[PDB]
């Protein structure tokens, strides 16, 4: 019931 | 460090010190970046703080924190799940350490690559863009200030 009801966005942070 | 935004823009940012990646109605993602050597414009992540804000009936507020040489498989209060024992809407699993916030269809992957930390966030578009006017500093949404690039 708690579970989210459709497209996903992605974020990333990484090194060098 | 290098940043890949929710809008798929790739950027190289200095962003030294504490900076918000995410600052919305459901989640706070805060990072600390340090110059690789003193005076360098090249910076890397030594601290990742994630605040899963209280979601009534699903999870109480949980805070995850990883630092260089300390990647626990639990929230700061020693718990591995949000709310009750029966409540599994928010959980942490070790492999990368992963946070599954099913209640907000959000996944957060954290790992240490060498001396620094990396982060990957998968969030539903309507939730990722659900924030108040004053929450205008969010590296994941708008990228870095021009002066930081």
């Amino acid at each position: 019931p708690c579970n989210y009801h459709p497209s996903y966005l992605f974020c990333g942070l990484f090194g060098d | 460090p290098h940043l890949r935004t929710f809008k798929d823009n790739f950027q190289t940012c200095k962003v030294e010190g504490a900076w918000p990646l995410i600052d919305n109605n459901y989640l706070s993602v805060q990072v600390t970046n340090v110059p690789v050597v003193p005076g360098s414009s090249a910076t890397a992540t030594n601290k990742i703080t994630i605040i899963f804000k209280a979601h009534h009936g699903c999870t109480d507020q949980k805070v995850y924190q990883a630092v260089t040489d300390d990647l626990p498989a639990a929230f700061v209060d020693g718990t591995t799940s949000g709310g009750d024992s029966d409540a599994k809407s928010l959980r942490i699993v070790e492999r990368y350490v992963e946070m599954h916030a099913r209640y907000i269809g959000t996944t957060v992957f954290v790992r240490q690559v060498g001396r620094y930390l990396t982060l990957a966030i998968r969030m539903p578009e309507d939730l990722a863009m659900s924030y108040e006017e004053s929450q205008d500093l969010q590296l994941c949404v708008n990228g870095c200030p021009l002066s930081e690039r």
Partner: protein, 205 residues
């Protein structure tokens, strides 16, 4: 071999103390030790990474565990020994310690000029490493006077589930000093050491 102890229970007494109690089925009812047997209590939490179990021997069927972290979930299990005979570790019981006032300040206090708004500053920070409970708020103190008494600093209360805050209408080309403190249901934590930030000036086009 030997039957492991049963009914392991964690009684929370404070932010650093938990009393552990258990029953031994091999023992008469209730609950007299009439031989040279001794118990071993083991405990740990999941913070920081890769901790090892702490152990303690107990002469009777209870053990008071001290020096624990506040607002922390611990696991506890018991075993029995009698010279040569030794049982396995019992079913694990859990216990979370009470909250304590935060004992360390907010960290990594960073002050930046807002892009396109040089009369606005953004204050960014990290939680105290010793939050000792759910952070319910932060207090940002700021001043143009580094020597002003604390009650004369501008107060900016803030929510506990956020680590960024914006302060508007400031003077350009001016040094400002910032201190933050965390708060929980038990009260105020210590203040971070003042951080200096000089606001930018105009670059005429």
């Amino acid at each position: 071999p030997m039957m492991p102890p049963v009914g392991v229970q964690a009684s929370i007494l404070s932010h650093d103390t938990i009393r552990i109690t258990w029953a031994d089925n091999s023992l008469p009812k209730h609950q007299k030790i009439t031989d040279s047997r001794y118990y071993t209590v083991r405990w740990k939490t999941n913070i920081p990474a890769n901790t090892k179990y702490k152990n303690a021997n107990a002469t009777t069927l209870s053990y008071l565990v001290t020096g624990l972290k506040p607002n922390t979930l611990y696991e506890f299990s018991v075993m029995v020994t009698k010279g040569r005979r030794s049982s396995t570790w019992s079913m694990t019981a859990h216990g979370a310690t009470f909250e304590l006032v935060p004992t360390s300040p907010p960290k990594d206090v960073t002050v930046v000029s807002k892009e396109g708004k040089p009369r606005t500053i953004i204050v960014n920070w990290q939680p105290p490493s010793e939050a000792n409970g759910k952070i319910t708020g932060y207090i940002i103190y700021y001043s143009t006077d580094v020597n002003a008494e604390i009650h004369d600093w501008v107060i900016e209360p803030v929510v506990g589930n956020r680590l960024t805050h914006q302060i508007q209408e400031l003077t350009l080309d001016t040094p400002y000093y910032f201190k933050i403190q965390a708060r929980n249901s038990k009260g105020m934590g210590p203040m971070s050491e003042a951080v200096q930030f000089r606001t930018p000036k105009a670059d005429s086009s």
